[PDB]
Write a protein that binds this ligand. Structure first.
Ligand SMILES: CCCCCCCCCCC(=O)OC[C@H](COP(=O)(O)OC[C@H](O)COP(=O)(O)OC[C@@H](COC(=O)CC)OC(=O)CCC)OC(=O)CCCCCCCC
Ligand SMILES: CCCCCCCCCCCCCCCCCC(=O)OC[C@H](COP(=O)(O)OCCN)OC(=O)CCCCCCCCCCCCC
Ligand code: HEM
Ligand code: HEM
Ligand SMILES: COc1c(O)c(C)c(C/C=C(\C)CC/C=C(\C)CC/C=C(\C)CC/C=C(\C)CC/C=C(\C)CCC=C(C)C)c(O)c1OC
Ligand SMILES: CCCCCCCCCCCCCCC(=O)OCCCOP(=O)(O)OC[C@@H](O)COP(=O)(O)OCCCOC(C)=O
Ligand SMILES: CCCCCCCCCCCCCCC(=O)O[C@H](COC(=O)CCCCCCCCCCCC)COP(=O)(O)O
Ligand SMILES: CCCCCCCCCCCCCCCCCC(=O)O[C@H](COC(=O)CCCCCC)COP(=O)(O)OCCN
Lengths: 110, 126, 54, 62, 44, 431, 110, 126
């Protein structure tokens, strides 16, 4: 179960990484895709307009938005690499499963 | 993880009812033949997941000649699968050999674990 | 002494009284230093020069 | 010498023991260290977070 | 008459440990609200 | 139990039992090992073996009499047993060895044979009896520099300096009429004991026991006796408890019955209703434990002792035990208090109603010296039945929550950590 | 056993900073390795927050450091902690290496 | 790691020479008094580094009463250092107690290890 829960964290960090690097091209799809996603956080009650202005660095998607999206894009792949090591540590204590669903301690190969 | 006490409680109510037994038991016979574990030389009690303290208790109390036969059926099924074949038809498990050999050891280890929980969380009645 | 027996009675403080007293500390500490700093530099600040042109 | 004879600890022991004298004086110092550390860790986090707000040249064009 | 275990809870754990789990929301609660003040969120 | 003071100042106490086939008569004094100094420590253990010497026992055996003696921290006893109808013969023997003639027991030939016998017993105790010498080191580190820290057998260094003039000096200060109780148990009635004592007129001078300067006090401390050539580890740990005549005397006894005793090799002791046994049986952390509540005239001790061969998991056994002591302040339940009520009434019912009149003579005489009377067993049962969960939580919040401890250990005790990580387990950090 | 000894991730924390057996007589020179781990955290955190405002072009590099010092809120605190924190990182590392020279820490089995 | 066989080879040549002994031995006496290990209650053979297989052999072959005394001197020196004091002057190691108790066990474990190397790398001489 611990091996499954760490893999869910890896999946969320990979979706966030691909979003941040796509906005660094600054094409026409990059500007309007960042506008749609960042405006979703203005619906949170009493802290909507404070999160979105802190995420922009201003009043819209501008120069501070792209310069901070590239610095966060360099960093999150190194956090994914640290969670992959924690993923392999939980695999080591019990081993892998097999397609029959029964125990594998009777017949192993290196 | 439902319980083996809950499975037997629902299953015994079906088998004692005369109109529910004629309707559910032929469906259960086609469900087992479509599963295909008997073509790998296995019984159903070999398929139960064993990494729990109830199942580790029942495997210790099994007699020694049945533990040797169970270990051979598991090893033979792992070799049959990696070659992507089935067993010959004269080595398939028959219907009168697929008996619950491990179920009476499971039901008595579960009744003892429930009795220990009701005594450790009991209230006095002065 | 005994004044650290009236408020607490042999125990530690608690984790919630640490966080509650830390926010009360921030507003009193910030006001007391800004008052001492501006009194030490009186006559040189902009609010003193702005009055003397009026 | 017998192991039932405990050595001399008199130069470090209290006047009389009086359990709420070293207890009350040590729980004040641990509590004061935890109060100043939570206030300092709060000012440090808010210093880094407010750097990501709008700069002085951005809100001049508002 | 026996109590309840919920798995690994107890209802007489919830005699004192559930006010305490809410005292983990009466104490240790303020690190959600004092750790904000510096950017204002004045509301109850 | 009937208590009666005579015309010359002798206190007589008697517990008649018509369904017994023996009788016991003796004298109990109110001075024990806690009435000595570090120089004469062991004079009470030497007076016991002078009474039980071979020339004294041979005179009593010709009359059909048996002798017993017991040295404790607060009292000493000298008891003669016989058949019910030879009770005046056991009074004449007790007269001729405490009142009228005591200089023939302290001859130089009898003293040096006795002194080398006691020196062999204390040397054998110090090298072979490991659960009992750890509990004696716990008394000497918890009550250090105070009269309650001296061992009851004496030490090997103090016993070799004792001469015959030390024993006469101790008898002249402590074997007095105002310090003594004459007891009688078994098939003996109160009026025949009083009339037999009054027939011998017994001058019996009017001295008074010396009073002590120092009062007993508890100190948080530890002592470690490491010995890597031993197969186990023996550990005792305690807090300050209740004295005799405390209002919380029975509440402290019920709290020790909640955790109780354990033997890992008995099948029925593994099935007891104790929540500590769930933690320690998974990896088999110990061999046995037992919880005590010792009470004296000035102070007391409350704790447990243990012995184990799992020398790499000692820190888990101490951590799990002290986390269960925390529950007496916050979350002790109702079934645990009702179970400990029934087992405490069974425990002290077997202590006060054994079939041995020598055991009953020690318990009766030690209680009249402190209180002047003996509490009945029927009145002690009503006090136990009136204890609630709020009484346990009020006692444990004062005596156990965040308090100083005393530790003693011997053997392979490398895995036992420092003082300050055991001291920090006396509170929870939760509340 | 305790949960800090049986969990896969908490056992690494327990075996390094909680239950680790230390010699009784080590002095304050053995505290320099703990300070070097604090220095590395300060440099990584202050550098990531400064990298959201930095431009690395040859005609924009000098003026973006001046933009951090003047326009970014508490930006002079970020730079001065970063520039002086690098000199403190080298002073503690020189003292850490000279402790190993004096006490023979380079020798076998280390 | 020079060798204890090489230290004894140079040191015995100095002590047998009459003019080299008058010049080097008073310098060696002031070198030991300025070292200060005897003020912590230690002998010199307690100071030798022990994480090597030659030194682990010599510590096994030491008699039991000398191993108990050596373990007490090491524990007493660790407690004296953390309090930043020295021992009382009546507990200092004297000059006639600073004897090489461990040196004969070291010299015979080294001569056996050298003989095993010359036999494992030997050449025939037909
Ligand atoms: C870049 C800035 C980094 C700042 C952090 C670095 C600070 C560490 C400095 C280097 C060092 O570790 O040297 C320490 C060494 C003393 O080590 P020791 O264990 O033998 O002495 C234990 C003491 O007696 C009891 O110490 P105690 O525990 O009783 O009191 C603590 C002491 C604070 O000490 C420290 O924090 C370390 C300096 O409190 C007081 O002094 C009370 C007065 C306010 O001192 C010496 O041996 C010689 C002193 C000068 C060495 C400086 C060399 C630098 C070039
Ligand atoms: C690539 C190679 C890099 C190498 C870097 C070399 C430069 C390093 C700069 C720092 C040098 C500091 C030396 C640190 C070594 C620590 C170990 C040590 O010397 O022990 C302390 C010394 C003896 O200690 P004891 O254990 O014998 O007893 C102490 C009782 N007071 O007790 C003492 O004598 C006190 C020590 C005081 C040392 C002061 C001299 C250093 C001054 C440096 C000035 C540099 C700025 C100008
Ligand atoms: C960069 C991402 C990942 C890497 C490098 C990685 C790596 C691995 C490796 C090498 C194994 C070994 C056995 C095998 O290949 O099946 C494994 C197993 C496993 N992984 Fe991942 N994984 C990643 C992402 C995930 C995700 C996203 C999930 C689930 C949401 C997950 C859950 C699991 C599970 C449950 C197993 C055990 C399967 C079994 O033993 O049958 N992992 N992983
Ligand atoms: C071991 C860690 C580090 C060391 C020793 C180090 C060292 C330095 C030094 C000496 C400077 C010049 C400072 C000056 O004189 O102004 C500098 C500048 C700079 N560093 Fe670092 N650095 C470290 C980590 C980082 C990291 C991880 C980042 C980015 C994610 C970073 C970002 C920067 C930036 C943006 C500058 C620009 C000039 C300035 O703002 O001062 N640093 N660094
Ligand atoms: C001998 O005694 C010791 C001993 O004394 C000590 C202290 C230790 C402890 C070890 C250390 C102190 C060294 C460990 C230090 C490191 C491994 C340094 C690693 C540094 C990092 C992983 C830094 C990571 C920082 C980040 C990822 C910054 C995150 C910034 C973000 C997310 C900014 C973006 C924010 C928003 C809101 C978008 C021992 O291990 C030890 O041995 C037993
Ligand atoms: C009652 C208890 C209260 C105690 C409270 C005290 C708390 C104090 C905390 C702060 C004190 C020091 C601060 C430093 C700190 O917290 O560091 C975090 C842990 C230190 O590093 P580590 O992960 O233990 O070592 C980490 C490394 O040493 C281990 O290497 P690794 O790679 O992880 O090995 C496994 C390899 C797996 O590799 C593969 C391929 O799978
Ligand atoms: C970045 C470091 C600065 C943070 C300072 C935090 C200090 C807070 C101390 C106040 C705590 C009050 C409660 C004390 C207590 O008894 O609780 C203790 C535990 O509390 C702690 O462990 C304090 C942790 C302090 C971390 C120190 C970091 C080590 C330095 C290495 C840095 C390498 C990067 C409760 O447990 P106990 O009662 O059994 O002792
Ligand atoms: C370069 C990488 C170096 C890696 C260093 C590893 C150490 C760093 C981690 C420090 C400890 C912080 C996490 C410990 C929290 C306890 C986890 C836990 O309780 O395990 C799990 C539950 O947590 C999870 O499901 C995954 C949490 C992922 C954590 C992501 C940070 C419970 O595991 P459990 O001990 O109960 O085993 C089953 C026995 N019934």
């Amino acid at each position: 179960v611990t091996l499954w829960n760490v893999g869910v964290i890896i999946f969320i960090l990979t979706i966030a990484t691909a979003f941040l690097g796509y906005c660094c091209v600054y094409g026409q799809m990059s500007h309007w895709g960042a506008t749609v996603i960042t405006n979703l956080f203005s619906a949170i009650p009493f802290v909507g307009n404070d999160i979105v202005s802190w995420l922009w660095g201003g009043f819209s998607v501008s120069n501070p938005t792209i310069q901070r999206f590239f610095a966060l894009h360099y960093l999150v792949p190194f956090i994914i690499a640290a969670m992959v090591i924690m993923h392999l540590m939980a695999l080591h204590i019990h081993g892998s499963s097999n397609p029959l669903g029964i125990t594998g301690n009777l017949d192993r190969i290196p | 993880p439902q319980s083996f006490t809950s499975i037997a409680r629902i299953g015994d109510y079906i088998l004692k009812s005369p109109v529910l037994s004629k309707l559910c038991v032929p469906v259960a016979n086609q469900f087992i033949n479509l599963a295909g574990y008997k073509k790998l030389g296995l019984k159903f009690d070999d398929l139960i997941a064993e990494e729990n303290p109830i199942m580790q208790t029942a495997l210790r109390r099994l007699p020694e000649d049945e533990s040797y036969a169970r270990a051979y059926r598991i090893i033979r099924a792992h070799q049959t699968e990696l070659t992507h074949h089935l067993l010959p038809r004269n080595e398939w498990i028959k219907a009168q050999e697929d008996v619950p050999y491990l179920l009476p050891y499971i039901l008595e280890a579960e009744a003892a674990a429930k009795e220990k929980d009701e005594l450790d969380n009991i209230e006095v009645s002065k | 002494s005994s004044l650290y027996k009236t408020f607490f009675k042999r125990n530690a403080v608690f984790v919630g009284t640490i966080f509650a007293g830390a926010f009360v500390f921030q507003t009193v500490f910030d006001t007391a230093i800004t008052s001492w700093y501006e009194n030490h530099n009186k006559g040189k600040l902009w609010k003193d020069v702005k009055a003397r042109i009026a | 010498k017998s192991t039932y004879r405990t050595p001399n600890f008199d130069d470090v022991l209290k006047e009389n023991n009086d359990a709420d004298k070293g207890r009350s004086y040590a729980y004040f110092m641990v509590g004061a260290m935890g109060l100043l550390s939570s206030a300092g860790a709060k000012s440090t986090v808010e210093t880094f977070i407010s750097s990501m707000t709008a700069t002085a040249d951005v809100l001049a064009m508002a | 008459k026996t109590g309840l275990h919920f798995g690994r809870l107890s209802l007489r754990s919830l005699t004192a440990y559930a006010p305490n789990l809410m005292l983990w929301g009466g104490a240790s609660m303020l690190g959600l609200f004092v750790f904000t003040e510096g950017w204002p969120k004045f509301q109850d | 139990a009937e208590v009666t003071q005579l015309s010359n100042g002798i206190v007589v106490a008697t517990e008649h039992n018509p369904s017994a086939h023996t009788a016991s008569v003796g004298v109990v004094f109110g001075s024990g090992a806690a009435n000595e100094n570090p120089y004469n420590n062991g004079v009470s253990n030497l007076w016991k073996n002078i009474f039980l010497s071979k020339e004294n026992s041979a005179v009593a055996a010709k009359e059909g009499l048996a002798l017993s003696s017991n040295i404790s921290r607060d009292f000493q006893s000298y008891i003669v047993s016989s058949l019910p109808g030879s009770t005046d013969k056991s009074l004449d023997f007790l007269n001729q060895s405490f009142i009228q003639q005591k200089a023939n027991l302290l001859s130089s030939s009898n003293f040096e044979a006795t002194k080398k016998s006691v020196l062999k017993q204390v040397q054998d105790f110090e090298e072979n009896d490991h659960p009992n010498r750890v509990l004696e080191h716990l008394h000497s580190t918890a009550f250090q520099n105070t009269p309650l820290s001296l061992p009851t057998r004496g030490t090997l260094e103090s016993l070799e300096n004792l001469v015959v003039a030390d024993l006469e000096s101790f008898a002249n200060n402590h074997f007095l009429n105002s310090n003594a109780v004459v007891v009688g148990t078994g098939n003996i009635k109160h009026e025949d004991l009083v009339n037999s004592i009054e027939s011998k007129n017994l001058s019996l001078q009017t001295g008074t026991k010396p009073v002590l300067k120092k009062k007993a006090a508890f100190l948080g401390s530890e002592v470690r006796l490491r010995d890597d050539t031993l197969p186990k580890a023996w550990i005792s740990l305690a807090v300050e408890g209740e004295p005799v005549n405390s209002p919380n005397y029975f509440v402290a006894k019920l709290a020790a019955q909640i955790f109780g005793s354990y033997n890992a090799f008995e099948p029925a002791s593994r099935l007891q209703g104790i929540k500590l046994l769930d933690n320690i049986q998974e990896y088999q952390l110990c061999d046995n434990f037992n919880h005590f509540s010792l009470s004296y005239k000035d102070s007391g001790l409350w704790g447990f002792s243990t012995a184990t061969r799992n020398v790499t998991m000692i820190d888990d056994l101490i951590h799990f035990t002290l986390k269960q002591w925390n529950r007496l302040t916050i979350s002790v339940t109702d079934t645990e208090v009702e179970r400990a009520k029934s087992l405490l009434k069974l425990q002290l019912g077997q202590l006060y109603e054994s079939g041995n009149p020598v055991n009953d003579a020690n318990l009766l005489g030690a209680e009249v010296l402190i209180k002047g009377s003996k509490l009945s067993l029927g009145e002690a049962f009503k006090k136990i039945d009136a204890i609630t969960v709020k009484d346990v939580k009020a006692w444990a919040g004062k005596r156990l929550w965040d308090q100083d401890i005393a530790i003693a250990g011997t053997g392979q005790i490398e895995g036992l950590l420092d003082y300050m990580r055991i001291r920090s387990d006396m509170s929870m950090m939760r509340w | 056993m305790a949960f800090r000894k049986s969990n896969v991730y908490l056992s690494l924390v327990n075996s390094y900073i909680i239950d680790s057996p230390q010699p009784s007589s080590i002095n304050y020179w053995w505290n320099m390795g703990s300070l070097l781990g604090l220095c590395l955290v300060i440099q990584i955190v202050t550098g990531i927050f400064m990298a959201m405002h930095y431009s690395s072009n040859i005609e924009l590099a000098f003026s973006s450091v001046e933009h951090i010092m003047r326009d970014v809120h508490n930006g002079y605190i970020l730079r001065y902690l970063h520039a002086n924190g690098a000199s403190f990182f080298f002073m503690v590392m020189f003292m850490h290496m000279a402790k190993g020279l004096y006490y023979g820490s380079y020798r076998s089995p280390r």
